Amino acid sequence: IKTPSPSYLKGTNGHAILLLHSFTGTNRDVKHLAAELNDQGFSCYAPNYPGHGLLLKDFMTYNVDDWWEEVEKAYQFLVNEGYESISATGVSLGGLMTLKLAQHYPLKRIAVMSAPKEKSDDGLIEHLVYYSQRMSNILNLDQQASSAQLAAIDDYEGEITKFQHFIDDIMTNLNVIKMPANILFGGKDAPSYETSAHFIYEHLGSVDKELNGLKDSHHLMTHGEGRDILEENVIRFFNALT
Ligand SMILES: [Cl-]
Ligand SMILES: [Mg+2]
Numbered sequence: 001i002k003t004p005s006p007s008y009l010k011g012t013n014g015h016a017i018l019l020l021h022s023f024t025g026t027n028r029d030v031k032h033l034a035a036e037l038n039d040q041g042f043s044c045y046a047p048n049y050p051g052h053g054l055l056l057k058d059f060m061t062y063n064v065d066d067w068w069e070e071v072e073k074a075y076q077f078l079v080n081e082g083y084e085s086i087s088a089t090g091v092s093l094g095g096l097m098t099l100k101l102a103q104h105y106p107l108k109r110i111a112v113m114s115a116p117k118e119k120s121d122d123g124l125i126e127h128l129v130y131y132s133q134r135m136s137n138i139l140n141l142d143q144q145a146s147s148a149q150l151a152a153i154d155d156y157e158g159e160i161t162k163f164q165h166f167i168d169d170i171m172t173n174l175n176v177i178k179m180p181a182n183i184l185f186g187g188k189d190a191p192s193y194e195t196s197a198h199f200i201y202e203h204l205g206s207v208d209k210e211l212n213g214l215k216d217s218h219h220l221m222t223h224g225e226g227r228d229i230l231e232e233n234v235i236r237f238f239n240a241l242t
Protein backbone atom coordinates (compact mmCIF):
# COMPACT_ATOMS: atom_id res chain seq x y z
CA ILE A 1 0.00 0.00 0.00
CA LYS A 2 1.65 3.19 -1.23
CA THR A 3 0.95 6.31 -3.19
CA PRO A 4 1.86 5.65 -6.84
CA SER A 5 4.88 7.40 -8.32
CA PRO A 6 4.28 10.06 -11.00
CA SER A 7 3.92 8.98 -14.64
CA TYR A 8 6.03 10.84 -17.23
CA LEU A 9 5.51 10.10 -20.92
CA LYS A 10 8.08 11.81 -23.14
CA GLY A 11 6.82 12.91 -26.53
CA THR A 12 8.25 14.49 -29.65
CA ASN A 13 6.28 17.68 -30.36
CA GLY A 14 7.65 19.92 -27.57
CA HIS A 15 4.29 20.49 -25.90
CA ALA A 16 3.72 19.14 -22.40
CA ILE A 17 0.39 18.37 -20.73
CA LEU A 18 -0.25 17.86 -17.03
CA LEU A 19 -3.05 15.39 -16.31
CA LEU A 20 -4.63 15.65 -12.86
CA HIS A 21 -6.77 13.00 -11.16
CA SER A 22 -9.90 12.92 -8.97
CA PHE A 23 -10.37 13.12 -5.19
CA THR A 24 -9.70 9.63 -3.77
CA GLY A 25 -8.49 8.54 -7.20
CA THR A 26 -4.95 8.05 -8.48
CA ASN A 27 -3.24 8.80 -11.79
CA ARG A 28 -4.87 5.60 -13.14
CA ASP A 29 -7.83 7.97 -13.66
CA VAL A 30 -5.91 9.55 -16.56
CA LYS A 31 -3.59 6.78 -17.79
CA HIS A 32 -5.31 6.01 -21.08
CA LEU A 33 -5.83 9.68 -21.98
CA ALA A 34 -2.19 10.45 -21.18
CA ALA A 35 -1.03 7.58 -23.40
CA GLU A 36 -3.34 8.61 -26.26
CA LEU A 37 -2.04 12.19 -26.11
CA ASN A 38 1.53 10.88 -26.06
CA ASP A 39 0.74 8.72 -29.11
CA GLN A 40 -0.08 12.05 -30.86
CA GLY A 41 3.33 13.49 -29.90
CA PHE A 42 2.67 15.22 -26.58
CA SER A 43 4.69 14.87 -23.43
CA CYS A 44 2.41 14.02 -20.52
CA TYR A 45 2.93 14.14 -16.76
CA ALA A 46 0.41 12.61 -14.37
CA PRO A 47 1.30 13.12 -10.68
CA ASN A 48 -0.44 11.45 -7.75
CA TYR A 49 -1.76 13.57 -4.92
CA PRO A 50 -0.13 12.82 -1.54
CA GLY A 51 -2.20 10.53 0.63
CA HIS A 52 -3.95 8.98 -2.34
CA GLY A 53 -3.66 5.23 -2.53
CA LEU A 54 -3.33 4.91 1.26
CA LEU A 55 -5.79 3.53 3.76
CA LEU A 56 -8.33 6.07 4.89
CA LYS A 57 -6.78 7.07 8.24
CA ASP A 58 -3.42 7.80 6.57
CA PHE A 59 -5.18 9.46 3.61
CA MET A 60 -6.81 11.90 6.05
CA THR A 61 -3.44 13.16 7.34
CA TYR A 62 -3.12 14.98 3.98
CA ASN A 63 -5.28 17.80 2.74
CA VAL A 64 -5.85 20.14 -0.17
CA ASP A 65 -2.68 22.11 0.61
CA ASP A 66 -0.63 18.92 0.13
CA TRP A 67 -2.48 18.04 -3.08
CA TRP A 68 -2.00 21.53 -4.54
CA GLU A 69 1.68 21.57 -3.54
CA GLU A 70 2.19 18.35 -5.54
CA VAL A 71 0.52 19.95 -8.57
CA GLU A 72 2.85 22.97 -8.26
CA LYS A 73 5.83 20.60 -8.06
CA ALA A 74 4.62 18.74 -11.16
CA TYR A 75 4.36 21.99 -13.11
CA GLN A 76 7.85 22.98 -11.94
CA PHE A 77 9.19 19.58 -13.03
CA LEU A 78 8.08 20.33 -16.58
CA VAL A 79 9.55 23.84 -16.46
CA ASN A 80 12.86 22.38 -15.28
CA GLU A 81 12.80 19.80 -18.07
CA GLY A 82 12.81 22.74 -20.48
CA TYR A 83 9.23 22.81 -21.75
CA GLU A 84 8.14 26.25 -22.92
CA SER A 85 4.59 25.06 -23.73
CA ILE A 86 2.75 23.58 -20.74
CA SER A 87 -0.99 22.88 -20.67
CA ALA A 88 -3.23 21.03 -18.23
CA THR A 89 -6.29 18.86 -17.97
CA GLY A 90 -7.97 17.07 -15.11
CA VAL A 91 -11.09 15.39 -13.84
CA SER A 92 -13.20 16.59 -10.89
CA LEU A 93 -10.66 17.70 -8.25
CA GLY A 94 -8.12 17.59 -11.08
CA GLY A 95 -10.31 20.01 -13.01
CA LEU A 96 -10.21 22.35 -10.02
CA MET A 97 -6.39 21.96 -9.87
CA THR A 98 -6.24 22.80 -13.58
CA LEU A 99 -8.24 26.02 -13.00
CA LYS A 100 -6.03 26.96 -10.04
CA LEU A 101 -2.89 26.31 -12.09
CA ALA A 102 -4.31 28.60 -14.78
CA GLN A 103 -4.72 31.37 -12.16
CA HIS A 104 -1.01 30.99 -11.22
CA TYR A 105 0.83 30.22 -14.46
CA PRO A 106 0.87 30.94 -18.22
CA LEU A 107 -0.63 27.62 -19.29
CA LYS A 108 -1.14 27.43 -23.03
CA ARG A 109 -4.64 25.88 -22.80
CA ILE A 110 -6.78 23.94 -20.33
CA ALA A 111 -9.41 21.19 -20.47
CA VAL A 112 -11.56 20.82 -17.35
CA MET A 113 -13.76 17.71 -16.87
CA SER A 114 -16.50 17.40 -14.26
CA ALA A 115 -15.36 20.25 -12.00
CA PRO A 116 -17.80 21.16 -9.19
CA LYS A 117 -18.51 24.76 -8.23
CA GLU A 118 -19.29 23.73 -4.63
CA LYS A 119 -19.21 20.56 -2.57
CA SER A 120 -21.22 19.72 0.53
CA ASP A 121 -19.82 18.13 3.67
CA ASP A 122 -22.08 15.11 3.13
CA GLY A 123 -20.93 14.70 -0.46
CA LEU A 124 -17.24 14.71 0.47
CA ILE A 125 -17.78 12.29 3.37
CA GLU A 126 -19.71 9.91 1.10
CA HIS A 127 -16.74 9.86 -1.28
CA LEU A 128 -14.38 9.04 1.60
CA VAL A 129 -16.65 6.20 2.74
CA TYR A 130 -16.78 4.76 -0.77
CA TYR A 131 -13.00 4.98 -1.06
CA SER A 132 -12.48 3.23 2.27
CA GLN A 133 -14.95 0.47 1.40
CA ARG A 134 -13.31 -0.16 -1.97
CA MET A 135 -9.81 -0.19 -0.49
CA SER A 136 -10.82 -2.69 2.21
CA ASN A 137 -12.32 -5.12 -0.32
CA ILE A 138 -9.29 -4.88 -2.62
CA LEU A 139 -6.95 -5.47 0.31
CA ASN A 140 -9.36 -8.01 1.86
CA LEU A 141 -9.04 -6.31 5.22
CA ASP A 142 -10.80 -8.17 8.02
CA GLN A 143 -13.86 -6.91 9.88
CA GLN A 144 -11.97 -4.99 12.56
CA ALA A 145 -9.42 -3.41 10.23
CA SER A 146 -12.10 -2.17 7.84
CA SER A 147 -14.27 -0.79 10.64
CA ALA A 148 -11.46 1.26 12.18
CA GLN A 149 -10.72 3.08 8.92
CA LEU A 150 -14.26 4.48 8.76
CA ALA A 151 -14.04 5.47 12.43
CA ALA A 152 -11.50 8.18 11.62
CA ILE A 153 -13.69 10.31 9.32
CA ASP A 154 -15.01 12.60 12.07
CA ASP A 155 -11.59 14.12 12.77
CA TYR A 156 -11.23 15.26 9.13
CA GLU A 157 -13.97 17.89 9.53
CA GLY A 158 -11.55 20.83 9.47
CA GLU A 159 -9.93 19.54 6.28
CA ILE A 160 -13.37 19.21 4.67
CA THR A 161 -13.98 22.89 5.44
CA LYS A 162 -10.56 23.71 3.96
CA PHE A 163 -11.47 21.79 0.78
CA GLN A 164 -14.72 23.75 0.50
CA HIS A 165 -12.89 27.07 0.84
CA PHE A 166 -10.35 25.90 -1.76
CA ILE A 167 -13.19 25.43 -4.24
CA ASP A 168 -14.78 28.78 -3.35
CA ASP A 169 -11.53 30.66 -3.84
CA ILE A 170 -10.98 29.22 -7.32
CA MET A 171 -14.60 29.93 -8.34
CA THR A 172 -14.44 33.56 -7.19
CA ASN A 173 -11.50 34.27 -9.50
CA LEU A 174 -12.34 32.53 -12.77
CA ASN A 175 -12.18 35.86 -14.61
CA VAL A 176 -8.39 35.82 -14.35
CA ILE A 177 -8.20 32.68 -16.51
CA LYS A 178 -7.77 33.84 -20.11
CA MET A 179 -6.08 31.13 -22.16
CA PRO A 180 -8.09 28.84 -24.45
CA ALA A 181 -10.35 26.57 -22.43
CA ASN A 182 -12.55 23.51 -22.91
CA ILE A 183 -15.09 22.89 -20.14
CA LEU A 184 -16.56 19.38 -20.25
CA PHE A 185 -19.26 17.55 -18.32
CA GLY A 186 -21.11 14.27 -18.67
CA GLY A 187 -24.79 13.92 -19.46
CA LYS A 188 -24.91 10.85 -17.20
CA ASP A 189 -23.36 12.74 -14.28
CA ALA A 190 -25.56 14.45 -11.72
CA PRO A 191 -27.33 17.63 -12.91
CA SER A 192 -25.21 19.70 -10.53
CA TYR A 193 -22.15 19.07 -12.73
CA GLU A 194 -23.95 20.56 -15.73
CA THR A 195 -24.88 23.59 -13.62
CA SER A 196 -21.28 23.81 -12.43
CA ALA A 197 -19.87 23.57 -15.95
CA HIS A 198 -22.12 26.36 -17.25
CA PHE A 199 -21.06 28.54 -14.32
CA ILE A 200 -17.37 27.88 -14.88
CA TYR A 201 -17.61 28.46 -18.62
CA GLU A 202 -19.53 31.73 -18.18
CA HIS A 203 -17.08 33.18 -15.62
CA LEU A 204 -13.84 32.40 -17.42
CA GLY A 205 -12.09 35.42 -18.89
CA SER A 206 -10.99 33.47 -21.96
CA VAL A 207 -12.00 34.77 -25.37
CA ASP A 208 -11.49 31.28 -26.86
CA LYS A 209 -13.61 28.91 -24.81
CA GLU A 210 -16.02 26.05 -25.41
CA LEU A 211 -18.51 24.06 -23.38
CA ASN A 212 -19.05 20.36 -24.16
CA GLY A 213 -21.73 18.30 -22.48
CA LEU A 214 -21.12 14.75 -23.66
CA LYS A 215 -24.39 12.88 -23.42
CA ASP A 216 -23.06 9.41 -22.64
CA SER A 217 -20.20 10.33 -20.30
CA HIS A 218 -20.39 9.72 -16.55
CA HIS A 219 -18.72 11.72 -13.78
CA LEU A 220 -15.30 10.13 -14.32
CA MET A 221 -15.34 11.10 -17.99
CA THR A 222 -12.04 9.40 -18.72
CA HIS A 223 -13.42 5.94 -17.92
CA GLY A 224 -16.19 3.75 -19.25
CA GLU A 225 -19.08 4.73 -21.47
CA GLY A 226 -18.41 7.56 -23.88
CA ARG A 227 -14.63 7.45 -23.48
CA ASP A 228 -13.84 7.42 -27.21
CA ILE A 229 -15.89 10.59 -27.77
CA LEU A 230 -14.34 12.26 -24.72
CA GLU A 231 -10.81 11.44 -25.87
CA GLU A 232 -11.48 12.57 -29.44
CA ASN A 233 -12.73 15.91 -28.11
CA VAL A 234 -9.85 16.50 -25.70
CA ILE A 235 -7.18 15.39 -28.17
CA ARG A 236 -8.62 17.62 -30.92
CA PHE A 237 -8.56 20.52 -28.45
CA PHE A 238 -4.88 20.00 -27.56
CA ASN A 239 -3.96 19.36 -31.21
CA ALA A 240 -4.76 23.03 -31.86
CA LEU A 241 -1.29 23.64 -30.33
CA THR A 242 0.37 21.97 -33.31
CL1 LIG B 1 -14.06 17.03 -6.08
MG1 LIG C 1 -5.05 4.96 -29.85
Ligand SMILES: [Mg+2]
Pocket residue numbers: 194213
Ligand atom coordinates in the same frame (compact mmCIF):
# COMPACT_ATOMS: atom_id res chain seq x y z
MG1 LIG D 1 -27.71 21.08 -21.38
